[PDB]
Design a protein around this ligand. Sequence first.
Ligand SMILES: *O[C]1[C]([C]OP([O])(=O)OP([O])(=O)O[C][C]2O[C](N3[C]=[C][C]C(/C([N])=O/[C@]45=NC6=[C]C([C])=C([C])[C]=C6N([C][C]([O])[C]([O])[C]([O])[C]OP([O])([O])=O)C4=NC(=O)[N]C5=O)=[C]3)[C]([O])[C]2[O])O[C](N2[C]=NC3=C2N=[C]N=C3[N])[C]1[O]
Ligand code: HC1
Ligand code: HC1
Ligand code: SF4
Ligand code: SF4
Ligand code: SF4
Ligand code: SF4
Ligand code: SF4
Ligand code: SF4
Ligand code: SF4
Ligand code: SF4
Ligand code: SF4
Ligand code: SF4
Ligand code: SF4
Ligand code: FES
Ligand code: FES
Ligand code: FES
Ligand SMILES: [Zn+2]
Lengths: 447, 583, 583, 156
Amino acid sequence: VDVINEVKASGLRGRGGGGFPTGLKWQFAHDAVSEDGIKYVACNADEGDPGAFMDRSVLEGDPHAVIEAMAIAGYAVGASKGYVYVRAEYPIAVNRLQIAIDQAKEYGILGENIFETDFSFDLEIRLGAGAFVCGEETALMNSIEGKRGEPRPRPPFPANKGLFGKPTVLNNVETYANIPKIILNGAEWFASVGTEKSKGTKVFALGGKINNTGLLEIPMGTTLREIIYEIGGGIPNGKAFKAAQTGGPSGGCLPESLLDTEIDYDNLIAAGSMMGSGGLIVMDEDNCMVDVARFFLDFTQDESCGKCPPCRIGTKRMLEILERICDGKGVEGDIERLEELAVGIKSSALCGLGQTAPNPVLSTIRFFRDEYEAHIRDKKCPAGVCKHLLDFKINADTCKGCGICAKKCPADAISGEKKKPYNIDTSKCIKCGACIEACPFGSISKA
Amino acid sequence: MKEITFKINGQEMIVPEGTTILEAARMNNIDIPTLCYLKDINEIGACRMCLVEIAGARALQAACVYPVANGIEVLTNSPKVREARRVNLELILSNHNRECTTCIRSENCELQTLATDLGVSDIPFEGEKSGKLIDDLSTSVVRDESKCILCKRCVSVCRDVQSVAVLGTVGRGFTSQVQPVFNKSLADVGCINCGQCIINCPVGALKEKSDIQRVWDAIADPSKTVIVQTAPAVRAALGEEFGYPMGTSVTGKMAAALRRLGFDKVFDTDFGADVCIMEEGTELIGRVTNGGVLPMITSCSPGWIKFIETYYPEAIPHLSSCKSPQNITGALLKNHYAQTNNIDPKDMVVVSIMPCTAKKYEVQREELCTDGNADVDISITTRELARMIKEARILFNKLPDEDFDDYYGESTGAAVIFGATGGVMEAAVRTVADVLNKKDIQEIDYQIVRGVDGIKKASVEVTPDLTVNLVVAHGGANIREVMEQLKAGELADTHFIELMACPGGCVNGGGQPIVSAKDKMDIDIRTERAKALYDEDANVLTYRKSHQNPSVIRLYEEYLEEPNSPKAHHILHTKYSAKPKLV
Amino acid sequence: MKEITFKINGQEMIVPEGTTILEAARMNNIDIPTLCYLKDINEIGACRMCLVEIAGARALQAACVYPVANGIEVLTNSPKVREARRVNLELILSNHNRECTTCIRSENCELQTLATDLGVSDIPFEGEKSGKLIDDLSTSVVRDESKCILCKRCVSVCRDVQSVAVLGTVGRGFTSQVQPVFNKSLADVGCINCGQCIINCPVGALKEKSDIQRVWDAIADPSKTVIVQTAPAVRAALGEEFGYPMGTSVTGKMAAALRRLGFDKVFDTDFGADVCIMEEGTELIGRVTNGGVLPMITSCSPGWIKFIETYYPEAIPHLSSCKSPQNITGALLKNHYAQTNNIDPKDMVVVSIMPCTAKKYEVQREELCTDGNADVDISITTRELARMIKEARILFNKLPDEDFDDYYGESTGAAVIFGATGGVMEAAVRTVADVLNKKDIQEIDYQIVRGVDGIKKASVEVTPDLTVNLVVAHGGANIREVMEQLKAGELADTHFIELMACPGGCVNGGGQPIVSAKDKMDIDIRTERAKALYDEDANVLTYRKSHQNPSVIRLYEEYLEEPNSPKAHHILHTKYSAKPKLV
Amino acid sequence: MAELIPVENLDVVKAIVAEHREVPGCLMQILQETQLKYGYLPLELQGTIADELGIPLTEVYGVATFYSQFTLKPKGKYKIGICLGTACYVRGSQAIIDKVNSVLGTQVGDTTEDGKWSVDATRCVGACGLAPVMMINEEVFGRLTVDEIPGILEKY
Ligand SMILES: *O[C]1[C]([C]OP([O])(=O)OP([O])(=O)O[C][C]2O[C](N3[C]=[C][C]C(/C([N])=O/[C@]45=NC6=[C]C([C])=C([C])[C]=C6N([C][C]([O])[C]([O])[C]([O])[C]OP([O])([O])=O)C4=NC(=O)[N]C5=O)=[C]3)[C]([O])[C]2[O])O[C](N2[C]=NC3=C2N=[C]N=C3[N])[C]1[O]
Ligand code: HC1
Ligand code: HC1
Ligand code: SF4
Ligand code: SF4
Ligand code: SF4
Ligand code: SF4
Ligand code: SF4
Ligand code: SF4
Ligand code: SF4
Ligand code: SF4
Ligand code: SF4
Ligand code: SF4
Ligand code: SF4
Ligand code: FES
Ligand code: FES
Ligand code: FES
Ligand SMILES: [Zn+2]
């Protein structure tokens, strides 16, 4: 009980993305009553968000701190056995954690009579198969049970009915990583770092077009300007900064207009994003936002289980409209259709994966509407990314007129004479892009 | 028992723990749209259509699978709820095939009713639908994949009730479907053709095979004589299709309607029912007096005989050798009636009207042939009969009452009570007690086994030297349980076992008209149909016993000599063999 | 009357000369499909779908228009007839929009029922449809010529029983369409917005202008108070939508259902009806004693008011100066109730539920406003009430009985007979006789005039010095004839003339639920609806006369002083102006 | 790498299911072991496994077809996986996939005729700090360009 009070006073809140305090979660698991007096502890290591890999890093760097928190939680809530769910496609992490548990049970930490006490705790490693939808917080329960990875409605919440109908505590690994400091040094150390709403530090895995890539231990509330410029080293090759995507495909995109915004739980959800898995991807001017919106929507489209009709059907209806915009066949009036689809899917999804599916489109429509209008109306791609919308034009002052691109053209759209610049028929070629790559002088440009 | 107090929309009331808000709203005069929810069968929360706003909640919650807690505040008609329901319906309707004029279910489809109620004005969302695959290869069950909405009711009906489990879910996303294993058809998997999945589908992707064209072609042949026979349970549920109230018998109107289609002869199956009762009593006595293979089990319903031939073959010796009443009547009309009236047996067609879809498979069996000729040629269900009435278009509400045709139209109460569960047992016990000890039994006291519904145990002392032990079971799970109990050696002292596949008897068969969850949550349909059958039984003022029928005694004293005679063994008996399963 | 002998399917009958095969089959328990058949209205033989084979003929014949002959042989269920029927059905269905999910008719469409009955499995004929354009510009009626099947029922209804003739046919082949005159809109031509063509359509190409969204927005506004007004004839035919037998009063259930929808106040029109009766009686006395314009004509129903403003502007002097009862109630609520309850006249919304579709235009008129405010804001029909109840999805069959609110909820049978034909004059005569002589009358015998049916004449002796002549007429042709004879000068002796647009009164209005020909042939619906209204009149045990209502007595004692006071003339009286016609 | 057992032998699967029957929720574990050993999961082996486990084939077929990592068809000798994560997407892995399609002479998700080359669009291997990323069996390559794809492919 004192451990629960200390954790609650520490202000520790789950960094998985939902922002629920772990103290309340532990209390609601402790006060529950089971039929046979058996309680469990289960843990999530199934990272699925692209561009984020701290969950495997903490296992492959220090699994002892991971497994000590296991016994801390088990003693706090009275659970006698625990489970771990780690992806099998990370052989080094699995081998390191199994060697760690073997050493711990050899020393006598795990098993019976832990440190000559009355608490006995045992661990069994469950080998997941690496499914994003299985990373969901009831789909993991079903996967461990041996059924399909289809999520269950809540309530009954997993704090009251978990493994085999018994109360169980569920938290991510990097949240457990900070409890040794809480126990050894006190709650005030965690309370002294960060803002009032959120305390402590957080792991950020950054990537994209950035000079230096990797992981950062940033204090709670650090602004994005400090992360991108002071630590990240700035935009490489002197390109123009457009935005940084936070929270992965389930999060959002922050442009330069809010670069000074404090990063926290409340500010992000007020800005249309959230923490997600903790991954940040910074991008420069060469990007077309329609294409990345389509990609972030396709990622969730390919991972939908198909149980509830919204996340199964509406995601594909949204993918089709973005595909037709990208192909240049789109017409006017698609903006309000996207708005209606997003608001409909947002409020009527059983699973949390389908709730945040239209979130990147919502973030992009509110900030970069001019790109959508240019794609729909002007039929022009500013970044030269949309294959069917850009035009290949040669530079007559630089082009030698050798004719190499003419022979490499598969649709027979390039014509001209020797020593003279050629001509490109846009309506003939399918804009494959082989002519620009086959040019040795680089005289072909995309408009 | 913990008592939970709660308020719904401003009405406070007491429930046991675990009561969903939907039940409380329905029993307190509030209705909420529903597609995937069935009582004690399907509570998964998959359709996402009964969303109800809850104060203080993040988003709309599903009502059907929401346990209620103390002191909540609920609103059901905020504009957000209506907009969400309309958007969800327009999303579900974007993949459905929308040819309602050419859809077999049509007038009683749940999706059409919900689309009409909520007012779906326009469909904005177009695209490409999931592929179409019509499985028009089986004998009794047909699937159209373009009409499925993935509500998953059929899976739970086939897995939890029938305990057969030949249906599952494959894939993820738009590639997800409901399918049998091996990517095969139902005719290649161990299905038993019960038909429950057909009557428990909410849109009409599952249908029965249509043999109406064969009947129409058979009638149009001037050189063929056509004889139709009627089941005892079809007249306890047919009126429901013509607007008649719940549980009304339409015997006279049925006879008039059948006579108006053009059938040459119209007969009732109760003659074969009484014949079967006499033969089964005779084998009872023969096996008891000679120490045969016991306990005896019936051979009436094709569903569980296919279940035996597929799953449990070592019990084929335990089976009775007598044919089903339909086959008995068909063979008797093919031989004795043909000899009497000088009509060529190969120039006759016999059609039966039964509430089953497995009878279509029973007709296809080659072993049920007499002198190289099939007993019954064409079999149809009750729904096809009603559709034939509507297409011939005779006003079923104003027919005058009529009677069946002699001599095969005579009926007795012991042969009428077959439809509900426990009727065959009652009739057999009555006849055997009257024959052996002159004991006048009228009703049988049934003891229900604690914890299990569907299994009935009793013990009737027919003679001081012979107490007849009785077992009755209906439903796939109950059949499986009693088979496990028999194979474990716990059924050594039993004498009779009756097994029906469909739950509640043939009054709840797969050929009966489909009733949605609306009327299904109001009145117990099996109980009321059994009540109608028993009420018709209690008003038979001519004869209430099987051996007292003049027609059967005349037949036995003119043609069949004595029960279990060599002629009876040659004509009315058949053998069974095991069948391969591919699951 | 010559007697003709004929046989239908070998059944002989003596009949009056000129009966059809379809009628005989109907009265002899045989039904034949019809689409373009209306009794006494449409006998055109155009749908070409009631074909019945006749022996010895070259081809098939249509039964609805075929006079029976001596000694003919009739076949109905031959395979050729069925093949021709299905070919015709799939041919007609080849142009229709098959979006049954998004139709307002949906459940009760003729084409859907026939397609389901005949079992059209597939549509082999593909091609292009006819041009679609929705005339969603008129005030009350909307045409959807994409669903039209060209049965010509609307044209015959508008020409024969309404004598308006604002519809015709144009074009040849696929381009043939039924349209108004000169390619205009129904708001631009001489239509009176009666709404009979809407309830006489078989497929649903004609609909009403839905105003449910305005009501839904008005309910959810926290700054507005919503008051609903209930018609007297909306409780005589609503039960059709909820499975009730006809002729049943649903007053308590309807009141409870309206209270559950969230309406702030619920009131009845009968108060305005009593006020109108008093004002008309006072005006009659004033015109009789001061040599006013005679005869005096009541002016409650908007239909023939539009008719006379459009077609007969010469006799507009004769109309009464009082408003319709619902306008009286609305103005009273907007002025006196607003003053009493400290509620701003612009901060309340009043909605009326009336079975008429001409009140949508009646409320919209700019002249019927009091103190710069609209008397009635929104008007919805009975069908829209049923649709709203279904959308809110409250169980209407289990609702208890509740009372109306004070003081506009007090009712008298003089205002309940008001909805049915002849009730306005009944109440007026009762009140005037009681006021002038204390002469107690309860019913008036109306003379049936030879040659024209539906026009009524009576003469009751009010005083020994004054006998009053009365005329009652309903229907477009009856109003046409009576106005023509009035203009001719043959009605110099008449005192009262009461005219109703819709035949049969407001119990047969344009906003009542639609019934098919099947339910129409069994029972005359108007007669039994009026019988239900009269039975409700006989069940009112409090006050059977208008002037005995305590509410109106208190109103005149406190606010309105005396009948036809300057305040009453300023508030409850309006003038009428002629409208140009474009036909 | 151990040799894959031919699917005609039904004794190894019987031993595996007998050894691992008592573990709750052992369906996925047995499926992973059989996938690793035999190489893939044909329908006959699935039916056999459901036969010893005493479970209808509906659950086994659903759970094996639910995970895209359980193969129903035989695979090639070498598996090619292009990281389609966000970090690899922003750097231009689409051109890498196009070059792989052009050179390999097969589409995404198809098995080559010779049974030597197989391509798959894996979402993330986890080394998303060295985009673009390619995986060949147990070898991971990072920071790749279009021109290096044929050179790396020539090594195998
Ligand atoms: O604990 C529990 C809770 C619940 O939650 P909430 O807050 O409600 O929310 P959610 O569901 O969470 O939301 C969602 C979110 O999330 C995030 N994300 C994204 C992406 C990725 C992620 C991750 N990483 O994760 C996991 N995954 C997932 C996925 C998905 C798709 C989802 C939807 C989900 C998830 N998850 C979740 C879980 O289940 C949970 O939440 C957690 O676990 C918690 O813990 P922490 O420590 O964190 O705190 C997950 N997880 C993990 O771990 N892992 C993984 O992987 C994510 C984003 O942002 C979105 O948006 O709370 C509680 N409760 C509630 N209620 C109640 C309670 N208790 C008691 N009582 C009551 N009444 C529960 O228990
Ligand atoms: O089922 C089926 Fe039947 O209804 C028929 O059809 S009639 Fe019966 O009682 C048995 O049992 C017999 O008689 S149940 C059938 O074979
Ligand atoms: O006219 C017609 Fe009628 O029947 C309709 O409905 S109901 Fe009436 O009493 C009057 O006013 C109302 O009130 S008369 C109508 O408007
Ligand atoms: S939102 Fe629905 S469809 Fe999507 S993963 Fe969750 S449960 Fe499955
Ligand atoms: S893009 Fe391709 S098709 Fe078009 S001109 Fe260049 S090489 Fe030819
Ligand atoms: S390959 Fe380049 S330089 Fe040669 S003709 Fe083409 S554009 Fe000109
Ligand atoms: S399943 Fe229902 S909605 Fe679909 S076509 Fe058939 S009747 Fe219409
Ligand atoms: S076949 Fe019918 S019952 Fe089964 S999932 Fe599809 S719609 Fe539901
Ligand atoms: S007929 Fe019976 S056994 Fe066959 S699939 Fe349907 S429910 Fe299952
Ligand atoms: S209805 Fe009766 S005969 Fe038909 S399958 Fe069910 S139990 Fe057997
Ligand atoms: S008009 Fe009738 S048949 Fe045509 S779609 Fe509408 S309801 Fe169906
Ligand atoms: S509403 Fe009346 S007047 Fe107008 S077109 Fe229809 S039938 Fe004719
Ligand atoms: S509008 Fe209606 S009534 Fe008029 S012709 Fe068309 S279908 Fe017939
Ligand atoms: S008679 Fe009644 S329903 Fe008909 S137009 Fe007049 S007010 Fe309307
Ligand atoms: S009807 Fe409630 S979730 Fe299916
Ligand atoms: S109903 Fe006879 S032709 Fe139309
Ligand atoms: S970013 Fe995930 S594999 Fe490269
Ligand atoms: Zn672009």
